[PDB]
Design an enzyme around this catalytic site. Structure first.
Site, PDB file in Angstrom:
ATOM      1  N   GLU A   1       0.824  -1.205   0.000  1.00  0.00           N
ATOM      2  CA  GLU A   1       0.000   0.000   0.000  1.00  0.00           C
ATOM      3  C   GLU A   1       0.861   1.260   0.000  1.00  0.00           C
ATOM      4  OE1 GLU A   1      -0.669   2.254   2.744  1.00  0.00           O
ATOM      5  OE2 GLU A   1      -2.185   3.345   1.594  1.00  0.00           O
ATOM      6  N   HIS A   2       1.962   1.232   0.728  1.00  0.00           N
ATOM      7  CA  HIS A   2       2.806   2.397   0.809  1.00  0.00           C
ATOM      8  C   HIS A   2       3.560   2.539  -0.465  1.00  0.00           C
ATOM      9  CE1 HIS A   2       2.322   2.761   5.093  1.00  0.00           C
ATOM     10  NE2 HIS A   2       3.331   3.605   5.200  1.00  0.00           N
TER      11      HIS A   2
ATOM     12  N   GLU B   1       7.270   5.251  11.385  1.00  0.00           N
ATOM     13  CA  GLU B   1       5.924   5.534  11.843  1.00  0.00           C
ATOM     14  C   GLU B   1       5.548   4.515  12.894  1.00  0.00           C
ATOM     15  OE1 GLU B   1       3.273   5.596   8.569  1.00  0.00           O
ATOM     16  OE2 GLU B   1       3.731   3.567   7.869  1.00  0.00           O
TER      17      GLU B   1
END
Ligand SMILES: CCCCCCCCCCC[C@H](O)CC(=O)SCCNC(=O)CCNC(=O)[C@H](O)C(C)(C)COP(=O)(O)O
Lengths: 178, 65, 63, 71, 84, 48, 412
Positions: free
Chosen positions: G51-52, G128
């Site tokens: 997804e990233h 993150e």
């Protein structure tokens, strides 16, 4: 019994091998014939639908619930043929299948009779030793280029060479020795 | 010796049919003959007494009191 | 709706075995491989038992 | 061994036909029904009734009984 | 009697000529069930099963996922019961 | 049995009813059974 | 009078659904039945890292080419991943409908994972995760999932363990991509000013040939999870506030009493106290997420528990009517906006297999009364073992005997 077992089974062969167990376990419940032939073309319908499901996940969810429907709707005493596993006549005439390498210790008197028999036997044994070299070499020259090896063995691929590892698929004790 | 037949009613030999009807018919002659001569299959030949019709005198039932 | 219930005896059949139906690519890779070990061993029994000119006892060292 | 003409076999006239008609009502065609025809086709066509087997030979058996009873 | 090949050959041919889907006037040995007779794989399960019931023995699964020429059936059956 | 949980254990009220009723009868059974034992153990010695 | 959601199916299997409305800002979106539930602990962050990276680079659009295109028409590009579904959606104008679909096609297939890009993302994701711990409610809900679904693929997280994130191979990713991106498990959903026939055409041209065949028939399959009542108590007394989540097992997507349970949530001290009905497939977590100072968690727990039992024992018609009215205003619709309507379609085609219209939702809401609400609440809340996840100053948070026992009223 002849061909070699595939490593993993496909989706198809699992579905198409239920169509056999199922229909064959429906002919134990339907002892008669007209009832059977009826109750069975109705079975195909079940398999006929859900034939074109493209959603694998679904397909493997119809299969997994088919084989549980079947396990609980199977006959305890199905009709398994004779000469097939479990049922009778399976290993019956195996007491009389001697392995053919035993006619080599016969007394020269015994082999005296039955004369032409051993004249042809000695030919075949010449065939066997005359090719072991070309065979094993074939088996090897054609060896896998990878660790992926299946029990399938190669055909001949050249005139005069005898399709390999053949001495025991040919020269097999006859089924009914009688 | 007989001949193999494919999808047809196997031909039958004279003897096969006659011997089969012979054994069965004697079975029925015997059942009928004995039934006539000895029909004690039903009732035996001795009738069950009605145990409830025996005058109290018959059994020694004293006159109450 | 009785579900077959494998016991140490009367084990779970091949079908009705959840594992078998769904398997990862790795699993297939295993099976595709285990055959190799067997095929290999099979082609080490089949050209030593089918060998003319042999009198010695095939040993079956696995036994 | 010669074999009976494949054509000889037909589903009408046998219990397969009634199975054939109800299957047709569902829309199924009952494909191998013709193969299962010689079962009902001929020789073995007649229905066998349970009294018939138990009573096989009774006709002569009683005929024999009467005669013996007479003598 | 013992099964001569030219008979077994006719017997397997015959049964198919009684399967409605397979044309009776084309089934020709060497006419692959699926790519010629155009029969569903689901069918071939049955075609084999008929043969297993015409000749009275079981063609194992793995050896029967391949009985597709209408002839393989005629030598495999014969090779099985040792018919020379 | 899942009938139990639904009929006896599930609602505290029901959980209770079963206890009280059972206890009411348990005494009968316990006393009876216990007495049988005690007596037999000393069957010979007791008034009668 | 709400327009119906029309669904078609392509050979590939991907379902190109759609919806139409006067609006002109369509949200096209691809939903995929692939999440952390389909990962097998060796690729626990594959969906997140794809997804990233999916947006950053595709074979046809090299480097940041895609993000430029998307800038050129002024469209917005979003993606998200849950434990069961992955979504790639674009908000754009109506007249830019073809190119957007083509862009989405690249994002699902023909995507390019630049080993370099892989590395850059590794940093982004690791960092993150290294700062994600900051968000408490996310920590508490992850703890609740872990302790409620111990030993199952539903305990893991979308992000996955740090290890898996560090160790990822273009090939691993490729696998997840080639394994869980099958065409029959895909929905092309459109909401707003779109025509269904034009979208169906566009679908084939750009989204055909989507893979459908697994490798060596490694056809995935799924496990019905177990709800293991258990607790987790991450005690850290330096935090100013405490977050506590208590849940029980939910029914699932296809079970209709969800609607009734939603009404129960609409019926329901410690700062925030939101009720929730996380509902995965074949299981879910009905419950509550209450934050609170360390000295009031105890009371809150009691209050929460009290409310539940009240709903198991003493539900009246007025609060049921209020909950039905509150639910009937959570209906998603064109007025909710395209993106929301867009999303629903994708989730409805992935979960139910069809788009449930709002009239059917209204019928299922109006059939709910007080008696069946307290029956379903007694079925799902009364005398059940909960999963408890606490984070913060949680010493006065009661242990498992006080919570579980509090779930049964000795007076019924
Ligand atoms: C007597 C015992 C009764 C037992 C009866 C049994 O329980 C009921 C039953 O079999 S329930 C049948 C439903 N079984 C399916 O629906 C599998 C469908 N499988 C596919 O569709 C494949 O994906 C594929 C496309 C390859 C088929 O292609 P193919 O032509 O078979 O090769």
């Amino acid at each position: 019994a002849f061909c070699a077992p595939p490593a993993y089974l496909t989706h198809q062969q699992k579905v198409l091998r239920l169509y056999k167990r199922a229909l064959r376990h429906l002919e134990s419940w339907c002892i008669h014939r007209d009832k059977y032939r009826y109750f069975a073309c109705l079975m195909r319908a079940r398999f006929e639908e859900h034939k074109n499901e493209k959603d694998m996940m679904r397909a493997t969810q119809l299969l997994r619930e088919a084989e549980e429907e079947f396990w609980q709707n199977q006959h305890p005493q199905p009709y398994i043929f004779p000469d097939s596993p479990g049922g009778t006549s399976f290993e019956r005439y195996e007491c009389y299948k001697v392995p053919e390498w035993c006619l080599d210790y016969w007394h020269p008197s015994e082999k005296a009779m039955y004369p032409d028999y051993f004249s042809k036997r000695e030919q075949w044994k010449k065939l066997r030793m005359e090719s072991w070299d070309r065979e094993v070499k074939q088996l090897q020259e054609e060896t896998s280029p990878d660790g992926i090896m299946t029990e399938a063995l190669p055909p001949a691929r050249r005139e005069g060479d005898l399709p390999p590892l053949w001495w025991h698929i040919v020269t097999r004790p006859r089924e009914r020795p009688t | 010796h007989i001949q193999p037949r494919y999808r047809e009613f196997p031909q039958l030999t004279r003897s096969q049919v006659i011997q089969g009807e012979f054994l069965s018919s004697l079975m029925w002659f015997w059942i009928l003959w004995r039934f006539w001569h000895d029909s004690d299959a039903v009732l035996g030949h001795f009738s069950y007494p009605d145990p409830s019709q025996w005058t109290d005198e018959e059994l020694g039932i004293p006159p109450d009191d | 709706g009785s579900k077959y219930k494998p016991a140490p005896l009367a084990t779970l059949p091949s079908t009705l075995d959840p594992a078998e139906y769904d398997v990862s690519p790795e699993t297939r890779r295993a099976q595709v491989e285990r055959l190799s070990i067997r095929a290999r061993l099979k082609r080490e029994y089949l050209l030593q038992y089918n060998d003319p000119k042999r009198v010695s006892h095939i040993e079956d060292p696995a036994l | 061994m010669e074999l009976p003409d494949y054509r000889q076999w037909k589903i009408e006239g046998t219990p397969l036909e009634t199975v054939q008609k109800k299957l047709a009502a569902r829309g199924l065609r009952d494909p191998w029904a013709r193969n299962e025809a010689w079962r009902y086709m001929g020789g073995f066509a007649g229905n066998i009734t349970f009294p018939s087997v138990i009573l096989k030979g009774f006709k002569w058996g009683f005929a024999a009984f009467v005669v013996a009873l007479g003598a | 009697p013992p099964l001569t090949l030219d008979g077994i050959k006719d017997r397997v041919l015959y049964v198919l000529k009684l399967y409605d889907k397979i044309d009776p006037e084309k089934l020709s040995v060497n006419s692959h069930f699926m790519k010629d007779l155009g029969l569903d794989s689901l069918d071939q399960v049955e075609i084999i099963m008929a043969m297993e019931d015409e000749f009275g023995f079981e063609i194992p699964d793995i050896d029967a996922e391949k009985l597709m020429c209408p002839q393989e059936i005629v030598d495999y059956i014969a090779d099985k019961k040792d018919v020379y | 049995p899942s009938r139990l949980y639904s009929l006896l254990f599930r609602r505290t009220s029901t959980f209770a009813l079963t206890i009280a009723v059972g206890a009411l009868f348990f005494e009968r059974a316990f006393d009876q059974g216990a007495d049988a034992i005690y007596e037999h153990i000393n069957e010979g010695k007791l008034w009668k | 009078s709400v327009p119906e959601t029309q669904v078609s199916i392509l050979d590939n299997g991907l379902r190109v659904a759609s919806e139409q409305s006067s609006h002109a800002t369509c949200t096209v979106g691809v939903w995929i039945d692939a999440g952390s539930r389909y990962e097998t602990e060796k690729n626990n962050g594959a969906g997140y890292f794809l997804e990233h990276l999916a947006f950053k680079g595709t074979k046809n659009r090299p480097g940041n080419a895609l993000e430029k295109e998307v800038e050129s028409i002024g469209a917005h590009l979003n993606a998200y991943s849950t434990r069961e579904h992955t979504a790639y959606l674009i908000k754009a104008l109506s007249k830019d409908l073809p190119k957007v679909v083509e862009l989405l096609a690249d994002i699902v297939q023909n995507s390019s994972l630049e080993d370099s890009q892989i590395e850059k993302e590794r940093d982004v994701i690791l960092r993150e995760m290294q700062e994600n711990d900051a968000s408490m409610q996310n920590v508490v809900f992850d703890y609740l999932h872990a302790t409620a679904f111990q030993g199952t693929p539903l305990a893991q997280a979308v992000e996955g363990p740090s290890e898996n994130v560090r160790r990822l191979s273009r090939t691993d990713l490729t696998d997840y991509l080639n394994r869980h991106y099958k065409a029959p498990r895909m929905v092309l959903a459109a909401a707003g000013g779109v025509e269904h026939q034009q979208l169906l055409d566009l679908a084939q041209k750009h989204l055909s040939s989507v893979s459908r065949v697994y490798e060596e028939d490694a056809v995935p399959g799924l496990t019905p999870c177990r709800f293991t009542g258990s607790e987790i108590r991450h005690r850290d007394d330096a935090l100013p506030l405490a977050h506590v989540a208590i849940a029980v097992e939910g029914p699932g997507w296809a079970n209709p009493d969800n609607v009734t349970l939603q009404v129960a949530n609409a019926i329901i001290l410690c700062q925030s106290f939101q009720t929730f009905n996380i509902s995965y497939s074949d299981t879910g977590l009905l419950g509550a997420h209450f934050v609170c100072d360390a000295m009031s968690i105890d009371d809150m727990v009691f209050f929460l528990q009290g409310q539940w039992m009240r709903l198991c024992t003493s539900a009246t018609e007025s609060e049921v009517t209020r909950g039905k009215n509150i639910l009937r205003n959570a209906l998603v619709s064109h007025l909710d906006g395209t993106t929301p309507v867009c999303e629903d379609i994708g989730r409805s085609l992935l979960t139910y297999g069809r788009r449930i219209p709002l009239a059917e939702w209204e019928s299922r809401i109006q059939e709910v009364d007080a008696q069946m609400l307290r029956d379903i609440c007694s079925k799902y809340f009364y005398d059940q073992c909960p999963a408890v996840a606490g984070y913060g100053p949680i010493e006065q948070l009661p242990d498992y005997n006080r919570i579980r026992s509090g779930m049964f009223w000795l007076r019924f």
